[PDB]
Symmetry: none
Subunit: 117 residues, 4 copies
């Protein structure tokens, strides 16, 4: 198995697609591909690296924060998840905001590990 915190690239993209409920996700060395629509066509999907793909997900999902000490180095992502006094979040880090965010998304669905591709 692979630790979700270490996920990167096509594999990370694949787990996000799967979490998002996309069709026939694949993770070639060339990159992840999926169908994001009713009866759509297979198209590249790189939310962990393409801002166009990842950005909307960040805005849409209940992300509560991103932090980077001194504006450099690693990012930490916080994704929100019902009692009055309670709170639960999912928390992952990564070298870029998109990587941190997508790892958090994957962890919120599959937990700490995911089968290796």
């Amino acid at each position: 198995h692979m630790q979700v915190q270490d996920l990167t690239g096509a594999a990370l993209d694949y787990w996000v697609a799967t979490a998002e409920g996309h069709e026939v996700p694949r993770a070639d060395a060339s990159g992840c591909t999926s169908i994001r629509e009713p009866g759509g066509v297979p198209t590249p999907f790189a939310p962990s690296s393409s801002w166009a793909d990842g950005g909307p997900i960040v805005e849409r999902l209940p992300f509560a924060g991103f932090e980077r000490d001194g504006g450099r180095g690693a990012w930490r992502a916080v994704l929100h998840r019902p009692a009055a006094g309670e709170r639960c979040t999912f928390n992952q880090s990564g070298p870029t905001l998109l990587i941190a965010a997508m790892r958090t998304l994957v962890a919120s669905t599959f937990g700490d590990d995911v089968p290796d591709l």
Copy 2:
């Protein structure tokens, strides 16, 4: 009839903390809360919501994960720990009040019988 834990203050708050902490014969006179914190102990004052000496060690010992105060002024918010992170959260005019209310909520929930 019942009391909201978030509104707890003074001796009553100290009492619920004693109880949550497993102290013996807690009580809550207007004079203040008293309990026995030891196997063979005498009843002694216990004011974790106002006495730093009593409340401080509890803050350090229990899994409190944070305290926050906007701009360093006004109300405190307390966060008590339980890739997932789940917490109990309560506020108060001081750090000790926020902390103890959070402790009491983590054990009894939102309300407690009135004293």
Copy 3:
């Protein structure tokens, strides 16, 4: 007469960012902001406050230290870095708007001439 940077939006916000970034002949038609981002370049659309492709890299490249959204809903607050820690802070309905307003404030201050 002048415009508050915190209220900046759309093409105007994109324009101030282009300017702060040192782009050439920035302009702000209703159609949108355009500029030259290269030594020998052509005028091309530039919408960092709405286009992720344009705004995203700026967020990653500039010393942004945080983005926050209460409960993962509503307005974003952006924090841009400058034992001491000093920051520029601005809000907006989306992460890109918050980020760019913060960028523009860090360079021009609170107001800017109206376009």
Copy 4:
């Protein structure tokens, strides 16, 4: 010189006393002593370890936060310090809340270093 982040014990107490404007602060191996009042008597002062001494300082000074990941390990302290869009804080860590707080206080006054006692 000594890094403020490494300050501990009587020495840390001494720098706090000094920052606070106490009289004849001292830092014996026995512990820090000072006069905190107009013409007062020299008395023990241990804000980095005694809650009775440190607690009130935390409440009085503009501390904005204390953080401890998962409720265990090291504490981080944030002390507030005037443009509309700007913000400055002092930030130090320590094994306990009082140590983190007092190091932050000392840093807010003397910076990163302080002469060794």
